[PDB]
């Protein structure tokens, strides 16, 4: 069994910003979801080998996880908040696409997504 390379967290060619909206996505959004009791399945790339999900990367072609998002935020990978919000939505979408409706992992994604939507609802004004 084989995992793909993880998503990019470092690219010196990619233009970067440090903004109050991106600061909010780290200090409020990422940290709120990261500390949650249901965070653990989403804190690193899906290990399709260890989790015995040999079809995972057959079905999921845009993998994303909060480990990757955390690295991207800490290493100022993003230009704008929209890129980071897209990474969260990709992570949730992948979970719903791959998994059987009603499975524990789907309920865990739903709990994290509820808090995500509450925090993004009050994304601060650009300085
Ligand atoms: C018996 C048995 C297998 C249990 C199972 C397989 C799918 C699975 O494990 N999915 C995931 C496990 C960890 C993290 N995941 C993310 C993120 N998305 N999906 C999963 N849940 N029905």
Swiss-Prot record:
Localization: Nucleus; Chromosome
UniProt site (Acetylated histone binding): 99
PTM annotation, UniProt: Phosphorylation by CK2 disrupt the intramolecular binding between the bromo domain 2 and the NPS region and promotes binding between the NPS and the BID regions, leading to activate the protein and promote binding to acetylated histones. In absence of phosphorylation, BRD4 does not localize to p53/TP53 target gene promoters, phosphorylation promoting recruitment to p53/TP53 target promoters.
Positions of the Bromo domain: 17-123
Effect of residue 104 to G: Found in a patient with a neurodevelopmental syndrome; uncertain significance
Notes concerning its domains: The NET domain mediates interaction with a number of chromatin proteins involved in transcription regulation (NSD3, JMJD6, CHD4, GLTSCR1 and ATAD5). The C-terminal (CTD) region mediates interaction and recruitment of CDK9 and CCNT1 subunits of the P-TEFb complex. It is also required for maintenance of higher-order chromatin structure.
Subunit structure comment from the entry: Interacts with p53/TP53; the interaction is direct. Interacts (via CTD region) with CDK9 and CCNT1, acting as an associated component of P-TEFb complex. Interacts with RELA (when acetylated at 'Lys-310'). Interacts (via NET domain) with NSD3, CHD4, BICRA and ATAD5. The interaction with BICRA bridges BRD4 to the GBAF complex. Interacts (via NET domain) with JMJD6 (via JmjC and N-terminal domains); the interaction is stronger in presence of ssRNA and recruits JMJD6 on distal enhancers. Interacts with NSD3. Interacts with NIPBL. (Microbial infection) Interacts with bovine papillomavirus type 1 regulatory protein E2. This interactions may serve for the tethering of viral genomes to host mitotic chromosomes allowing successful partitioning of the viral genome during cell division.
Disease annotated for this entry: Cornelia de Lange syndrome 6: A form of Cornelia de Lange syndrome, a clinically heterogeneous developmental disorder associated with malformations affecting multiple systems. It is characterized by facial dysmorphisms, abnormal hands and feet, growth delay, cognitive retardation, hirsutism, gastroesophageal dysfunction and cardiac, ophthalmologic and genitourinary anomalies. CDLS6 inheritance is autosomal dominant. A chromosomal aberration involving BRD4 is found in a rare, aggressive, and lethal carcinoma arising in midline organs of young people. Translocation t(15;19)(q14;p13) with NUTM1 which produces a BRD4-NUTM1 fusion protein.
Family: Belongs to the BET family.
Additional information: JQ1, a thieno-triazolo-1,4-diazepine derivative, and I-BET, a benzodiazepine derivative, have been tested on tumors with success. Treatment with GSK1210151A (I-BET151, a I-BET derivative) has strong effets on mixed lineage leukemia and promotes myeloid differentiation and leukemia stem-cell depletion.
Protein name, per record: Bromodomain-containing protein 4
Highest classification ranks of the organism: Eukaryota, Metazoa, Chordata, Craniata, Vertebrata
